[PDB]
Design a protein around this ligand. Structure first.
Ligand code: CLA
Ligand code: CLA
Ligand code: CLA
Ligand code: CLA
Ligand code: CLA
Ligand code: CLA
Ligand code: CLA
Ligand SMILES: CC1=C(/C=C/C(C)=C\C=C\C(C)=C\C=C\C=C(C)\C=C\C=C(C)/C=C/C2=C(C)C(=O)CCC2(C)C)C(C)(C)CCC1
Ligand SMILES: CC1=C(/C=C/C(C)=C/C=C/C(C)=C/C=C/C=C(C)/C=C/C=C(C)/C=C/C2=C(C)CCCC2(C)C)C(C)(C)CCC1
Ligand SMILES: CC1=C(/C=C/C(C)=C/C=C/C(C)=C/C=C/C=C(C)/C=C/C=C(C)/C=C/C2=C(C)CCCC2(C)C)C(C)(C)CCC1
Ligand SMILES: CC1=C(C/C=C(\C)CCC[C@H](C)CCC[C@H](C)CCCC(C)C)C(=O)c2ccccc2C1=O
Ligand code: SF4
Ligand code: SF4
Ligand SMILES: [Ca+2]
Lengths: 37, 138, 75, 75, 80, 73, 153, 31, 146, 153, 37, 31
């Protein structure tokens, strides 16, 4: 994965953040919310 | 200690962790009318009609209010009681101690700190070097 | 002031590469340099009827009067 | 001078100075030249007010003399 | 806790009690002056040591004296 | 022992510098008085004091230091 | 209306219920931080505190330390932060010996002598290895870059 | 022609402003 | 005053220029210019943008002693109950800051007492006085003769 | 006078209050060691015991082991002491399964079945990484020497 | 930092001991001592 | 001429004798 466009380091960090960090936080935060008393 | 708190919007100058750990101080007074008073911790609050209960961090803040409650209002509030409140629930009543304000002489009061001599009649520190006592003590 | 104390100490220890300077770890005032650039580009673009800049301290011409500088760009 | 003179007022305090004056009042009472207006040390605010006046008078006059002699010499 | 001592040169004009901001001082009956009262210090545990009483004392040298002793939470005047 | 052979020229060394904060400029600046390491020049005058009272070797100064360790004990 | 009120009802406690101090987002983010999260033993409180603190602490010495222009830039950034965590866990354990020595409370497990020592034990383990994993991601940055852009497929 | 690095990054900084207001609207709609 | 007199008179005696002292010490500008300004030249060039020499530690100590002497002026001019009221805001800030209010002091933070920072400001004054002059005494003499 | 007395006042307990066994320096050093320090949880006092023990344990096999004359001297010193800590924590954990099985005393937290297992858990983690940090200081000893003498400035 | 003097390995270990290990122990032990009951 | 390695190390072992006696004096003066 390369890029001639500017800020090509941004898909280097946002793809594993929207791909992993956003689902792990949100589904983690939803799992506490939907199963709380 | 019954009394509704005065109408105050809150301040950062009030009680710290000392109030719930060591001691805090409660001032209780009765007001004829709904009046505005300057809080000793910063800001201005409104006296409720009837009895007021205010918790303060120091005894000086309660007495700075009690000085203000006695001279900065057209009807003088001369019935304020000042308490020391402990976290265990025990309350020690402080001011006025005998029910009479201390600038007025009252019978039944015992003299503490009186020495029956002049301030220049204190003994020399050379006579009491290793007794540990100060010239004003012995 | 601790930035000053750092490179006072770093220059004293013979470490100019470890200082806060333009030949070392650079602290550029990039927002003030950008504002200076906007004022240099101000005549014509955002001040179209202004012939020259408001001040030459922002950038541009060096003004001489009697072989002596009146105003220069303060970089 | 006046910057250093300020630190007499700023660093010290009047209970030293009142005790010094009442020894000089004695030497005036010895020669019957003690004034009816009793000599007092400056008050605590005035001891600070004189010290902050002489500090800023001394420091600014230094910089004024430094700036004006330097900038008259150059050019 | 500081020590507040009251000496026999008291005239009983109650200015130390009125200058007291910590309710340390009070007037007790006495026989040594015309006002027939002497200042007393029953509550020196609340003494901050600020010496407003010594400022208000009109006698010479002083009839009330505050000696700064051991420092507690109350004497250091801490809200924390 | 290097200083007593030329007291007017050799700078007396107090002790060695061991500072990890030193760069290559300060190592070369403080490698002085004919030493092979960064040193501090003595200005207490103990070299002139020791040479006048008969001390001429580093063994004598070492024996004086060990004796003063014993004298402190 | 008015969004700055008295803090927890009492207007004489020296605090204010501000949109920074007592908002809905403040009460659910601070309260779910490791030092305040309900039900956590202090070994997991200290571990998650340690892993966060150890991870960014090699950063200043990696990019700005004295070894940043040698071949040991990531090594010198690690030893700087490893020795910082060692002072930091010594600051924790000396605090817990001092603060909790006369009696032990019951409301909070963290504010207890055995509880704060679990916090310091967790902070040490997460602090050093959180620094070490970021060191491992920085020495193998050429590996991690090739992972994240698919150079090994 | 092409966008710069400071144009892509500034678009992200402006994008906090819908992100902050979508958080406020979602919490207001939940209440 | 006396060590300035000892150093400047001996600087002319050792260099042979005794007329430098004898015709400039009679007024305080010659003390200011020919002694304080002139002999500090190799001191303040102990380090510069173009390198260092053996007077680099004395140049750093000279500025160190200026800092310690000027820091003592804070304890001698500014006094206690300014700082006690400042600490009370800092005490409030720690108590109301989450993740930091879990850490609590055992000793209550108060300002230094009235006697104490008169001693502490004097100690900074004296340590600042001595480290300034010992740097200037040595680097001007060792820069000229050493 | 006399410096050897009865141990803790009882002359019929089989011990003596000697300048080695019951001096003031002995009671404040032994009592402040991790195994005896007041208020420590067993996970931290296991950790501090492990960190000390893991640190010196690679040293014998580094300088005297069979790999000391190869290019893997520090690895063989580490591998020799990682497996010794693993036997040591197996010795601790099997001891706690044996010694504390019948009842749980209320006196000492360390002398309890769950308490001794926190001790073994701390000794394991401090033992292996304490061996690893000394391994890391030994493989990067050329870096550490250059740090300590300022070769990277 | 080098040295032509003997035992030049001794300032290699004593400077970070007097510099770091001596204050961290002493001010560590003082902090327990001045704040104990 | 110069001191040897065993001379510097012997001085440190001798220096443990004032190190132990200053510890005994300091604890005696504290009593
Ligand atoms: C909803 C519109 C939209 C969609 C469909 C995409 C889609 C994509 N973006 Mg994105 N982007 C958008 C808005 C959008 N973008 C906006 C307006 C910006 C300017 C600030 C960005 C900035 C941006 C960057 C800088 C990056 C991408 C990238 C990408 C790709 C991977 C996802 C990622 O890393 O996100 C990262 C995106 C962000 C951190 C910012 C997105 C902010 C938008 C406005 C949020 C939109 C939320 C949406 C309306 C709600 C949907 C709800 C629904 C799911 C229920 C993918 C092609 C990556 C890429 O190009 O990979 C090759 C990457 O590096 N985008
Ligand atoms: C959009 C999300 C997305 C992306 C970005 C990836 C990307 C990748 N996947 Mg994956 N995949 C995903 C979703 C995604 N996957 C899903 C939805 C599935 C189901 C279809 C799969 C199924 C799949 C399989 C079955 C496998 C992959 C693997 C791979 C990796 C190949 C290289 C490698 O060994 O990585 C190693 C990289 C990682 C394990 C990620 C961790 C790396 C970071 C740097 C560690 C950070 C830790 C640090 C301490 C915490 C940071 C703190 C923070 C505050 C910064 C690559 C990173 C392969 C693999 O080896 O991955 C394990 C593999 O076996 N993928
Ligand atoms: C941030 C920068 C900084 C730091 C911290 C250092 C650090 C040090 N330098 Mg230095 N140096 C610097 C900048 C700095 N320098 C600069 C800019 C220069 C100019 C180039 C120098 C020039 C220089 C020279 C010329 C020398 C050093 C030396 C030293 C070492 C001191 C050895 C020692 O006995 O310490 C112990 C420290 C002390 C005894 C002082 C402590 C004083 C405290 C404040 C008061 C006393 C303690 C108190 C009573 C109670 C505290 C509690 C206590 C009991 C724990 C040490 C490595 C010396 C050296 O190499 O050692 C042989 C030395 O000769 N350096
Ligand atoms: C003086 C200030 C200072 C300095 C100089 C640095 C400098 C550094 N920090 Mg740091 N940091 C600081 C302060 C500072 N920090 C502060 C105050 C914070 C807030 C607490 C942080 C938070 C922080 C984080 C959270 C991260 C950095 C990182 C870094 C490195 C980034 C360099 C880089 O881009 O290349 C190298 C790094 C990259 C190109 C980025 C890679 C990031 C990771 C490996 C990807 C994560 C993947 C995925 C999202 C994780 C999901 C896990 C999965 C299991 C779900 C660098 C060493 C990164 C780091 O340590 O990387 C090892 C990083 O992740 N720092
Ligand atoms: C040069 C002299 C000097 C210095 C160093 C100080 C220092 C300070 N003044 Mg100041 N002040 C001075 C003279 C000075 N004053 C004088 C002359 C007056 C009398 C009128 C005052 C009166 C005064 C007032 C009335 C106020 C201050 C305040 C402060 C603080 C400023 C904010 C701050 O913390 O900055 C950061 C600290 C510094 C810039 C100091 C230098 C720190 C160095 C760089 C750190 C070096 C690292 C360290 C030494 C490593 C430890 C090593 C170990 C061996 C100990 C700071 C503590 C203000 C304050 O406290 O508000 C916050 C305040 O209100 N000052
Ligand atoms: C009181 C006299 C004194 C002074 C101020 C110095 C000063 C110094 N020594 Mg030391 N030294 C001394 C005594 C002295 N030494 C004695 C008598 C010996 C012979 C055994 C040593 C052995 C020695 C070695 C082997 C080393 C130093 C080094 C150094 C430097 C850094 C500090 C250090 O690592 O100490 C370490 C010192 C020791 C481990 C032993 C010193 C023991 C002394 C006697 C303790 C003195 C305590 C004092 C009298 C009590 C007053 C304290 C008071 C301020 C509260 C510095 C120049 C280092 C050096 O040369 O760096 C380049 C170094 O490697 N010294
Ligand atoms: C006399 C004490 C002294 C000495 C010897 C040092 C020495 C040094 N300082 Mg320092 N400094 C000190 C006091 C001192 N400082 C003080 C008083 C100040 C305030 C003015 C400073 C301010 C300062 C700054 C601001 C910085 C330095 C840094 C540096 C280091 C530069 C190289 C590096 O990255 O180190 C890395 C080395 C370490 C962090 C030390 C750890 C190395 C050992 C081997 C780890 C041992 C761990 C092990 C498991 C435990 C051993 C057990 C034991 C029983 C043996 C160097 C070691 C810089 C740096 O990067 O250091 C962090 C830096 O940022 N100094
Ligand atoms: C039988 C007898 C006699 C004969 C004595 C004979 C035959 C010899 C006597 C020799 C003696 C008694 C020598 C004494 C030496 C004392 C010394 C050496 C003390 C030194 C103390 C200090 C504190 C020095 C510290 C320092 C040292 C260590 C240095 O290295 C340099 C720095 C300095 C500070 C100077 C006489 C006839 C009398 C009468 C009858 C009894
Ligand atoms: C969102 C948010 C934010 C931000 C955040 C941040 C700041 C971040 C950071 C982050 C971080 C900073 C993180 C960290 C990370 C870490 C990690 C994740 C680690 C891990 C670890 C591991 C992986 C492991 C390790 C180890 C090893 C390797 C071995 C030894 C041991 C151990 C186990 C330890 C804020 C605040 C603004 C607020 C708002 C919200
Ligand atoms: C003083 C004294 C003594 C001595 C002592 C000794 C013997 C010492 C030793 C020492 C030691 C023996 C120490 C040790 C050290 C260790 C350390 C300090 C470690 C730590 C660690 C760290 C740093 C970290 C780690 C890690 C990592 C890296 C990752 C993984 C995990 C962990 C976290 C673990 C005696 C006895 C004679 C007695 C008298 C007194
Ligand atoms: C010296 C000193 C004094 C003594 C100063 C006194 C008694 C005042 C001296 C006044 C003299 C008499 C005149 C001062 C100069 C006049 C302003 C000049 C007037 C203009 C002339 C031309 C008439 C203090 O009282 C004092 C109080 C608190 C802190 C510090 C100090 C302090 O440092
Ligand atoms: S010092 Fe203040 S509080 Fe104490 S007795 Fe005097 S006036 Fe009252
Ligand atoms: S001490 Fe002074 S103020 Fe108090 S009663 Fe006596 S004369 Fe009045
Ligand atoms: Ca470098």
């Amino acid at each position: 994965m390369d890029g001639s466009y500017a800020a090509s380091y941004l898909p280097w960090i946002l793809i594993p953040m929207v791909g992993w960090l956003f689902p792990a936080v949100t589904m983690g935060l939803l799992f506490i919310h939907i199963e709380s008393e | 200690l019954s009394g509704q708190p005065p109408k105050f919007g809150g301040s950062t100058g009030g009680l710290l962790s000392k109030a719930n750990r060591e001691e805090k101080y409660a001032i209780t007074w009765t007001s004829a009318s709904e009046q505005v008073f300057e809080m000793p911790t910063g800001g201005a609050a409104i006296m409720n009609e009837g009895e007021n209960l205010l918790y303060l961090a120091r005894k000086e803040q309660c007495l700075a209010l009690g000085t203000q409650l006695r001279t900065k209002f057209k009807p003088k509030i001369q019935d304020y009681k000042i308490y020391r409140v402990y976290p265990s629930g025990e309350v020690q009543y402080l001011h006025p101690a005998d029910g009479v304000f201390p600038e007025k002489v009252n019978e039944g009061r015992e003299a503490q700190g009186t020495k029956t001599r002049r301030i220049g009649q204190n003994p020399e520190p050379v006579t009491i070097k290793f007794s540990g006592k100060a010239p004003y003590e012995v | 002031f601790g930035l000053y104390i750092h490179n006072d100490t770093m220059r004293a220890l013979g470490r100019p590469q470890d200082m806060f300077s333009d030949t070392a770890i650079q602290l550029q005032p990039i927002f003030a340099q950008w504002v200076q650039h906007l004022h240099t580009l101000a005549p014509g673009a955002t001040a179209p009827n202004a012939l020259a800049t408001a001040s030459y301290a922002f950038g541009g011409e060096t003004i001489a009067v009697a072989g002596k500088v009146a105003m220069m760009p303060i970089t | 001078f006046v910057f250093a003179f300020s630190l007499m007022f700023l660093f010290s305090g009047r209970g030293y100075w009142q005790e010094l004056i009442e020894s000089i009042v004695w030497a005036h009472n010895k020669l019957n030249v003690a004034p009816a207006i009793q000599p007092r040390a400056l008050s605590i605010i005035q001891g600070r007010a004189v010290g902050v006046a002489h500090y800023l008078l001394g420091g600014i006059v230094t910089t004024w003399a430094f700036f004006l002699a330097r900038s008259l010499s150059i050019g | 806790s500081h020590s507040v001592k009251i000496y026999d040169t008291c005239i009983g004009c109650t200015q130390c009690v009125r200058a007291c901001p910590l309710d340390v001082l009070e007037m007790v009956p006495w026989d040594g002056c015309k006002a027939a009262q002497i200042a007393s210090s029953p509550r020196t545990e609340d003494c901050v040591g600020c010496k407003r009483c010594e400022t208000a004392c009109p006698t010479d040298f002083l009839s009330i004296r505050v000696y700064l002793g051991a420092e507690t939470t109350r004497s250091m005047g801490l809200a924390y | 022992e290097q200083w007593i052979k030329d007291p007017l020229n050799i700078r007396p060394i107090a002790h060695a510098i061991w500072d990890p904060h030193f760069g290559e400029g300060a190592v070369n600046a403080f490698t002085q008085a004919g030493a092979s390491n960064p040193v501090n020049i003595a200005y207490s005058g103990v070299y002139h004091w020791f040479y006048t009272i008969g001390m001429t070797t580093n063994q004598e100064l070492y024996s004086g230091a060990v004796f003063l360790l014993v004298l402190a004990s | 209306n008015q969004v700055v009120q008295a803090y927890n009802g009492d207007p004489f406690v020296g605090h204010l219920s501000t949109p920074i101090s007592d908002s809905a987002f403040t009460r659910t983010f601070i309260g779910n931080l490791p030092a305040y999260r309900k039900g956590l033993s202090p070994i997991l409180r200290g571990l998650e505190v340690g892993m966060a603190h150890g991870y960014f602490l090699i950063g200043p010495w990696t990019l700005l330390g004295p070894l940043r222009d040698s071949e040991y830039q990531y090594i010198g950034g690690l030893i700087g932060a490893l020795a910082l965590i060692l002072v930091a866990t010594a600051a924790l354990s000396s605090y817990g010996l001092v603060t909790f020595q006369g009696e032990q409370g019951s409301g909070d497990t963290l504010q207890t002598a055995d509880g704060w020592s679990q916090f310091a034990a967790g902070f040490f383990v997460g602090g050093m290895g959180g620094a070490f994993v970021a060191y491992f991601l920085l020495e193998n940055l050429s590996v991690v870059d090739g992972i994240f852009r698919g150079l090994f497929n | 022609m092409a966008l710069s690095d400071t144009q892509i990054l500034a678009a992200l900084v402006v994008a906090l402003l819908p992100a902050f207001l979508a958080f406020r609207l979602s919490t207001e709609l939940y209440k | 005053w006396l060590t300035f007199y000892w150093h400047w008179k001996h600087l002319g005696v050792w260099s042979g220029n005794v007329a430098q002292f004898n015709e400039n010490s009679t007024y305080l500008m010659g003390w200011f210019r020919d002694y304080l300004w002139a002999n500090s030249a190799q001191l303040i060039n102990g380090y510069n943008p173009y390198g260092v020499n053996n007077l680099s530690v004395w140049a750093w100590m000279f500025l160190f002693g200026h800092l310690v002497w000027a820091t003592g002026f804070m304890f001698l001019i500014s006094w206690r109950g300014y700082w006690q009221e400042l600490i009370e805001t800092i005490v409030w800030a720690h108590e109301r800051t989450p993740l930091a209010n879990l850490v609590r002091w055992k000793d209550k933070p108060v300002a230094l007492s009235i006697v104490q920072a008169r001693l502490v400001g004097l100690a900074h004054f004296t340590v600042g006085y001595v480290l300034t002059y010992a740097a200037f005494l040595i680097a001007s003499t060792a820069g000229k003769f050493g």
